[PDB]
Structures are given as C-alpha cells and as structure tokens.
Amino acid sequence: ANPLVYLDVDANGKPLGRVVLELKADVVPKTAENFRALCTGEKGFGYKGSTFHRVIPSFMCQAGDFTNHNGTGGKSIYGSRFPDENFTLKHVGPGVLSMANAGPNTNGSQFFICTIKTDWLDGKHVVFGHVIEGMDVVKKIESFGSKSGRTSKKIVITDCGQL
Numbered sequence: 727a728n729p730l731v732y733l734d735v736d737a738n739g740k741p742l743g744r745v746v747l748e749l750k751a752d753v754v755p756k757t758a759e760n761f762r763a764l765c766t767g768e769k770g771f772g773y774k775g776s777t778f779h780r781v782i783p784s785f786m787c788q789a790g791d792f793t794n795h796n797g798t799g800g801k802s803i804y805g806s807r808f809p810d811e812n813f814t815l816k817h818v819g820p821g822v823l824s825m826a827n828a829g830p831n832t833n834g835s836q837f838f839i840c841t842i843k844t845d846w847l848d849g850k851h852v853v854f855g856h857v858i859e860g861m862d863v864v865k866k867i868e869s870f871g872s873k874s875g876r877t878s879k880k881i882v883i884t885d886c887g888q889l
C-alpha cells in the first residue's frame with residue numbers, strides 16, 4: 727500500500743492542524759521514499775521543525791528547506807540532489823504534492839502543495855503524492871502567504887512522520 731505521512735503545522739506557535747499526505751510509491755517509489763524518510767527522520771535529518779518558507783496565494787505552499795529555511799537549500803536521503811524519477815503524475819489541481827527544484831535533476835528535500843491546478847509545472851516538477859485530509863490546513867497556510875511568497879506569520883512543521 728502507498729505510505730501515508732503527516733505534517734503538523736503551526737502559525738506563530740498556534741496549531742493549524744494536521745495535513746495527511748498519500749505518497750505514490752507505486753508510480754514514483756524513489757521520490758516517495760525520500761519524502762517518507764524525511765518525515766520520519768530515519769537518516770538523521772528531515773522536516774521536523776522546518777518551515778513553509780514560500781507561500782503564494784492561488785499557487786502553492788512550499789517547504790522543506792531545512793538547511794537554509796529560505797528556498798536555496800535542503801538535501802535528499804540519496805545525496806545533495808537526485809534526478810527527476812519520471813513526470814508521470816501531473817499537476818491536476820489543488821492538493822497535489824510535488825518536488826520543488828532548481829531546474830532539471832535537482833530534487834533534494836524541498837516540496838510544495840498546490841492550491842490550484844499548476845499545469846504549467848507538468849514535466850518540470852515531479853509529482854509524488856496528494857493531500858487526503860487536512861486540505862483546510864493547507865488553505866490556512868495559504869492565507870498567510872503573499873504575492874512575493876513571504877509569509878505573514880511563522881509557519882512551522884512542528885512534527886511529521888508516517889501513519
């Protein structure tokens with residue numbers, strides 16, 4: 727079965743709730759495993775305590791830069807980056823979970839959750855999961871974003887793991 731993982735998120739130290747994500751290990755096993763292991767911290771590093779550092783209304787909420795917390799960093803469980811596994815799954819609508827990158831073959835740890843259909847990212851960002859519960863939490867995160875992506879409050883993944 728595809729793994730389910732969670733992100734528990736605060737805004738300014740106030741809980742927003744839990745996002746439940748299904749990882750499509752059937753289609754993108756390697757990309758799904760990276761995210762799963764970063765949620766559990768099993769390699770000695772991962773998402774716990776890091777932030778949603780770029781949140782753009784009517785676009786997406788981006789997180790996972792646990793080295794620099796600013797969108798320039800992060801790393802994968804396989805090394806500093808790994809190639810795009812495939813582009814099979816598409817940016818079909820809100821709730822899509824997809825890998826951030828700095829161009830081709832630069833997947834590390836940064837990821838995003840879409841709040842609209844981001845079809846122009848098809849073939850450029852590897853989709854690997856979807857929100858199955860807590861989309862309302864994602865909408866709360868989105869409400870603290872801005873056109874530049876700078877957040878109005880400190881949005882923190884206080885805990886995460888595998889369900």
Ligand SMILES: NCCOCCNC(=O)[C@@H]1CCNC(=O)/C=C/C(=O)N2CCC[C@](Cc3ccccc3)(C2)C(=O)N[C@@H](Cc2ccc(C(=O)c3ccccc3)cc2)C(=O)NCc2ccccc2CC(=O)N1
Nearest residue numbers: 783784785797798806807826827828832833834835836838
């Ligand atoms: N209301 C409606 C609004 O509609 C507007 C629509 N806007 C859209 O379509 C927009 C239009 C185009 N602008 C953008 O690309 C926005 C870019 C942006 O913010 N920075 C700020 C952060 C830094 C930069 C540049 C930089 C500087 C140093 C090192 C690396 C990059 C630029 C970046 O690029 N960092 C990646 C994140 C990442 C991910 C993984 C790694 C990594 O492991 C690694 C990389 C290399 C070697 C080893 C490891 C590093 C960085 C970033 O953030 N990628 C952008 C992104 C992220 C998620 C989803 C999509 C998109 C595309 C987008 O945003 N496209």
